Amino acid sequence: EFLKPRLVDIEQVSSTHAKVTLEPLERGFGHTLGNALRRILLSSMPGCAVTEVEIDGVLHEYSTKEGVQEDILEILLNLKGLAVRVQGKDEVILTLNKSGIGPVTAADITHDGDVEIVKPQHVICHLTDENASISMRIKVQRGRGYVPASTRIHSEEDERPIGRLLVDACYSPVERIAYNVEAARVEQRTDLDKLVIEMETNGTIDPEEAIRRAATILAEQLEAFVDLRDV
Amino acid sequence: PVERIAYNVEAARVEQRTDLDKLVIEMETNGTIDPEEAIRRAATILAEQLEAFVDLR
Amino acid sequence: ARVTVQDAVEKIGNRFDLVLVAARRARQMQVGGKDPLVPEENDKTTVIALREIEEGLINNQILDVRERQ
Amino acid sequence: DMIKGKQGRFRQNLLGKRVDYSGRSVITVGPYLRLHQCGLPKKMALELFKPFIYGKLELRGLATTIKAAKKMVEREEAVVWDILDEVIREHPVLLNRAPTLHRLG
Numbered sequence: 001e002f003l004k005p006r007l008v009d010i011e012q013v014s015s016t017h018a019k020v021t022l023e024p025l026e027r028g029f030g031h032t033l034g035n036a037l038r039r040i041l042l043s044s045m046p047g048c049a050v051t052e053v054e055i056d057g058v059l060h061e062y063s064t065k066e067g068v069q070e071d072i073l074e075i076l077l078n079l080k081g082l083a084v085r086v087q088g089k090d091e092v093i094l095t096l097n098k099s100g101i102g103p104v105t106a107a108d109i110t111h112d113g114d115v116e117i118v119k120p121q122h123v124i125c126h127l128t129d130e131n132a133s134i135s136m137r138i139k140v141q142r143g144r145g146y147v148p149a150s151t152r153i154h155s156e157e158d159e160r161p162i163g164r165l166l167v168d169a170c171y172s173p174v175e176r177i178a179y180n181v182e183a184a185r186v187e188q189r190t191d192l193d194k195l196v197i198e199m200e201t202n203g204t205i206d207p208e209e210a211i212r213r214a215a216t217i218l219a220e221q222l223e224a225f226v227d228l229r230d231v
Numbered sequence: 232p233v234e235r236i237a238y239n240v241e242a243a244r245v246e247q248r249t250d251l252d253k254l255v256i257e258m259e260t261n262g263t264i265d266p267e268e269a270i271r272r273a274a275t276i277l278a279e280q281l282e283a284f285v286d287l288r
Numbered sequence: 289a290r291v292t293v294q295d296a297v298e299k300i301g302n303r304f305d306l307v308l309v310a311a312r313r314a315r316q317m318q319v320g321g322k323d324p325l326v327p328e329e330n331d332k333t334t335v336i337a338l339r340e341i342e343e344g345l346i347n348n349q350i351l352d353v354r355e356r357q
Numbered sequence: 358d359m360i361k362g363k364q365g366r367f368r369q370n371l372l373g374k375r376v377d378y379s380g381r382s383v384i385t386v387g388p389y390l391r392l393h394q395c396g397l398p399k400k401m402a403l404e405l406f407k408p409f410i411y412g413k414l415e416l417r418g419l420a421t422t423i424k425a426a427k428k429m430v431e432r433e434e435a436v437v438w439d440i441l442d443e444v445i446r447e448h449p450v451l452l453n454r455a456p457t458l459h460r461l462g
Contacts, residue, residue: 216286
């Protein structure tokens with residue numbers, strides 16, 4: 001003798017902002033599921049991000065190119081924010097080549113099949129000289145969480161090329177998660193509640209897949225609990 | 232049937248990663264069911280509600 | 289860890305030669321001339337000797353009789 | 358002159374020296390601790406207990422000779438942390454704060 005929650009309509013207000021609803025939730029499980037999901041989403045969602053960059057005419061992060069106004073370090077800082085969706089491979093090499101005066105935005109990346117540039121207007125640099133030309137190759141990996149350069153330095157693995165520029169990896173697409181349990185008038189019941197989870201992401205992970213994966217992880221840990229050895 | 236329930240979380244490290252934790256759950260029940268099986272049906276209940284979404288298997 | 293030595297000082301009320309007898313015992317234990325009379329729980333030899341003292345098995349006189357024997 | 362005077366002997370010789378196996382650093386709260394314990398950084402603990410580490414490593418046979426013990430400590434493999442954990446169990450350390458007003462300093 002129980003009820004059980006069914007995934008219902010998933011409204012999309014913007015590309016980044018989303019509302020997901022769960023209608024038939026038993027009394028008391030509203031807050032439990034809300035909080036559990038919030039934790040799993042904020043903590044464990046896998047994403048892809050740039051790990052290191054090689055630009056041609058630059059020895060180290062602190063030098064400067066002719067005809068650009070940003071420092072190289074600020075260029076890395078801009079790349080850290082680049083939101084990209086990789087489908088098949090784990091490590092992709094994107095190529096950016098632009099010349100002439102203008103703002104080098106993310107759209108100018110060489111269009112590959114498997115990679116989706118979510119925000120093509122996102123700026124990267126500004127050229128300021130007719131003959132100034134920038135070429136670069138950005139290596140993008142898949143991962144979970146937050147990994148800084150300095151920890152990965154232990155596993156250098158022949159970092160010998162001085163042209164390599166390491167970037168801290170924020171392997172996480174979800175920026176914000178909130179949930180509300182509000183009275184769910186079901187046609188034959190008195191006191192039932194519906195959970196509405198509104199989530200804001202960088203526009204890479206789709207809501208359905210996020211929620212499914214989170215529920216998967218929590219269910220897996222519960223599976224670990226079901227059996228008890230006592231041996 | 233549970234008269235008292237509490238859980239402490241404390242630091243535990245796997246030889247390189249220190250930011251991992253151990254969960255010690257102290258539970259007192261009122262005789263009827265023994266604690267192991269109580270935990271059993273608790274985890275069971277939460278899993279049946281979650282069951283509807285989880286499909287990656 | 290053995291957080292209090294109160295019972296060991298209650299065995300010998302000087303609270304100073306306690307340290308001496310425990311040091312002699314733990315030194316006989318570390319340099320492996322002797323063996324512990326208590327089942328060790330991964331303690332080091334200092335806390336082992338204190339644990340032995342608090343259980344009444346070892347004092348100065350037992351040390352003297354065993355050494356001359 | 359060698360005997361008498363400050364610079365010579367007693368007044369300076371056996372009055373205030375720098376000792377070994379000692380370290381210094383900033384203090385922090387750590388509420389989860391038991392009353393009889395203290396949080397100690399890995400790296401400081403390794404540096405302090407270096408010779409203990411070498412002795413225990415050689416006792417366990419993980420290292421043939423002492424130089425191999427240094428090389429294994431400077432690589433910092435899992436065995437080193439396990440031995441450090443094993444030696445630390447009951448070994449107590451002394452904590453001191455610059456103005457030791459009374460004996461509880």
